[PDB]
Amino acid sequence: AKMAFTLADRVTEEMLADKAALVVEVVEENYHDAPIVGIAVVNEHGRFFLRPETALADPQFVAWLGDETKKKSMFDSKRAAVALKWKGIELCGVSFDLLLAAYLLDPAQGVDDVAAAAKMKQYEAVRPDEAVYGKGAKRAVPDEPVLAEHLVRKAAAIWALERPFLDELRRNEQDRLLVELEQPLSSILAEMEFAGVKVDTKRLEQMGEELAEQLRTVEQRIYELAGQEFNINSPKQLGVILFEKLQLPVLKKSKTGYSTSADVLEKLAPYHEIVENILHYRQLGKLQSTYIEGLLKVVRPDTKKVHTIFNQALTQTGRLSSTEPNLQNIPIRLEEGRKIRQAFVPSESDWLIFAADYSQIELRVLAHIAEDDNLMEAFRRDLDIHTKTAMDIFQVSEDEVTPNMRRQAKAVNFGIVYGISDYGLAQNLNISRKEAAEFIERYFESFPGVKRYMENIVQEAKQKGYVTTLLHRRRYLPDITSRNFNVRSFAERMAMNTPIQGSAADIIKKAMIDLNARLKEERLQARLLLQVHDELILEAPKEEMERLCRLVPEVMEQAVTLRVPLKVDYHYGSTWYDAK
DNA sequence: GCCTGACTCT
DNA sequence: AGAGTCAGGC
Ligand SMILES: OC[C@H]1O[C@@](CO)(O[C@H]2O[C@H](CO)[C@@H](O)[C@H](O)[C@H]2O)[C@@H](O)[C@@H]1O
Ligand SMILES: [Mg+2]
Description:
The PDB classes it as transferase/dna. The entry lists the keywords transferase-DNA complex, oxidative DNA lesion, DNA damage, trans lesion synthesis, replication. It forms a trimeric assembly. Structure of the high fidelity DNA polymerase I with the oxidative formamidopyrimidine-dA DNA lesion in the pre-insertion site. By secondary structure, the protein is of the alpha+beta class. It has four domains: 1-194, 2-Layer Sandwich (Nucleotidyltransferase, domain 5); 195-309, Taq DNA Polymerase, Chain T, domain 4 (Up-down Bundle); 310-360 and 505-579, Alpha-Beta Plaits; 361-504, DNA polymerase, domain 1, CATH 1.10.150. The protein has 22 helices and 19 strands. The relative contact order is 0.09. Helix content is 51%, strand content 13%. The strands form six sheets. A six-stranded mixed beta sheet has the order 1-4-3-2-5-6. Bound molecules: a molecule of 2 linked components (GLC-FRU) and magnesium ion. The protein binds a DNA duplex through helix 10, helix 12, strand 12, helix 17 and helix 21.
């Protein structure tokens, strides 16, 4: 059965109505500078398919695309907006994005095409993209009649589905979350991705060469100490060398044999010199394969920029993710790895990189939502939260907090945030379950409000079926009623963690929106380049630094008002590395 | 081609 | 707790 539509060869006025479902199809997973393979419009006057070489060269269609008062309903408008930016065309007036609507209604559905969103409301008159385009090697744009019918069915689905999605969003009290947060954020992310980040490829290559030399040296030491050559990057081959040839103790096994995970290796270190060398080899090898070679693979040779894609409709807690490359996991913890950041530079001469980050946003959020008196007071005094947590758990003065005590209190703070469990904490601090339970017990004695919150949120998740964040993002937790201890326990941790991690995600998203508006009002040339969960990275003329130093922290700090202050630290420099 | 297990980040 | 990428290997 084949849906009726006009296969148009020229644009007409009735295609330019002030309300329409719009499909601007980009089949390449990475949409940066990618082809647009077809366009479909469904509105009051009918259903239309347009070839892109026709539509995009029509002045009236382009004018309609960029006219803010002509409203469009779409799926994944950021994909279209970005593909259109590369062609020098502005997309405006997108008042409804079905991908973002589906994501807000239930992030666990993993909706990634119109068909999956449609299935949520018993609408099935549209094919999954994978059925049409195929998968992997055999992936391909089909012939025009098939392609056209597909885009029109997607448009028609968007047209039919807008009202029930908005209606449910409204009952969820998530209508503003879509309209005033996620959709405006989607435009901001499109600009960030399109702007891209400049890479000093010569610097990267130099680092690659030094790395290659050190890798060879560690590699040869490894063969020396094992008394033979083998594939160090083969967990199978390595396990044989470690646990059979060298007789190292077996403390952990994988599902598939011996575990050679990094924490297993740390413990083995005192037995044989080879172990530290393997850890080092693996550190350097990760830098080499992923942050030199992999990174250089995705730099555009023409502009020396990388253009990540932020997935805004993926994570279960409302964070963004980043791909091709992932710019949210660039090394920082170890100095040799952190040097990778010297290769990320401003895109114009006499510009600098500026980075601002919230300090302890998750614990500040927890203090607000739990209304824990002790925790709120700690932030009101702007104390070192880890030292203060140690003072309370160990019942000592600040003077008596040793480094090991602070380290352990820090670890409990992590656990408390992730949904605390004696097992997870024990694993982390290399201690017994009974020991870990005493820590948690001491914690809850010092922060009774936090304990009440943990109990109350788990009950609420049971009662309601979901938990929510500050700005009404929602996560359903059906395993919270499971009679399987481990399944139920995962869900209980999720109930505890999600309002924390998710409310922190909400706050920085709102900061981003506020920041973008302030930058425009101030006519600054500064631009957002990246978000890394609790931090924003910008580039700007060196002449705007002093202004950004006052502006960016204030905007981020005032994004929401909590029972405790938000605090933002900031730095700038000639490279991302230097913005520290 | 998918999987596993290893690594990277907040 | 939440993510993404890579080499080895089936
Ligand atoms: O365009 C991003 C948007 O598309 C989806 C599918 O609807 O993901 C596709 O694009 C991502 C970016 O290239 C890929 O990582 C992903 O594999 C691909 O299916 C959504 O998940 C995402 O929000
Ligand atoms: Mg921070």
